[PDB]
């Protein structure tokens, strides 16, 4: 089976600010990658292993509203720009890529996934380059192998004019570091 | 600050299939 | 005639 | 929901289309030059490839292009009119070994179906099932490019 992916909105905007403000979220979680938002940016967040990771840059040190309240971080790495919560009662998780394959497939917020050739432990070059615009609101979202295991998170876009030609991720290996730190 | 909230889902683990009526 | 579509296949399994 | 694959049928017998760049494609041996049904009347072919067994209307209601591959790979699979995916390994350019063999019925009525990447992206049209002593062991398809240059 190859790498297909759906994306369902679960709410609004007004529903949302409510349940930052609450931290309660009473709603039923289903996915491997949750779309994420905070009052002033939305963006993805990838259940590896048990743990519901992210881009630091767009969670900050942020809570994760849940059912029994805001749920506080398990790891914050400002340097790795990784935050990750205890993944969400409901969500399934993906685990870590162990083929060391370099043709990646980039998962984004809209369910496309995107081929990326690997070019180095943290840069991979799309195939076929996209405006940064398809980008937005991708980060935190997975890179996964062929086999669908985790590689990465895509952080940041490799932008020329507005054409994105390459994606910087954080390798699965800084989320074990950031774990044993 | 407050809580970051999810908003949507991406489902992967989902396989073709033939749409109901 | 026509060729008709008797039936539809969503790849992504999506449910909705 | 929407579909990108829509189960077909004519009087004789039952395929499959797939939805790609806006079009729906199916193969010429299975449609031949009818017409697709629509609830405004039956619409005709934009596209009608004889030489390559390729015809095309205009993307019908309910339905979701599909993506072009750009990733080269060879690791393709086919997705059967029961939902079915059977991992074919690309052996040329308009051909590919199932990495498993099936009896020719389980891939019956399959022809028009996508040959799908690792990501999903349309690689090619199932053509025809190649198949010794009534066993598929690979197959015959019609590749994106032809579908891109047709259009
Ligand atoms: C991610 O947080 C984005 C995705 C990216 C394609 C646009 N990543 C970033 O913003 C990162 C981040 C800072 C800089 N980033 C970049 O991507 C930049 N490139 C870059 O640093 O390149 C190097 C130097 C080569 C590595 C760039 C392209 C110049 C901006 C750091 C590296 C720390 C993401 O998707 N953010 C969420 C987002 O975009 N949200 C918005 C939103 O909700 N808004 C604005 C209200 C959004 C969501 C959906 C659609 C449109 C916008
Ligand atoms: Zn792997
Ligand atoms: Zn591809």
Redesign the interface.
Known sequence: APITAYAQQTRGLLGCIITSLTGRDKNQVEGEVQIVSTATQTFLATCINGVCWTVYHGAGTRTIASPKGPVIQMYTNVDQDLVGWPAPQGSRSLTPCTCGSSDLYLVTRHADVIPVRRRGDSRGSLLSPRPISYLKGSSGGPLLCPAGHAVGLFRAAVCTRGVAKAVDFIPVENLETTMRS | ???????????????????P?
């Open positions: 600050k407050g809580s970051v909230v999810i908003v949507g889902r991406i489902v992967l683990s989902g396989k073709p299939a033939i749409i009526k």
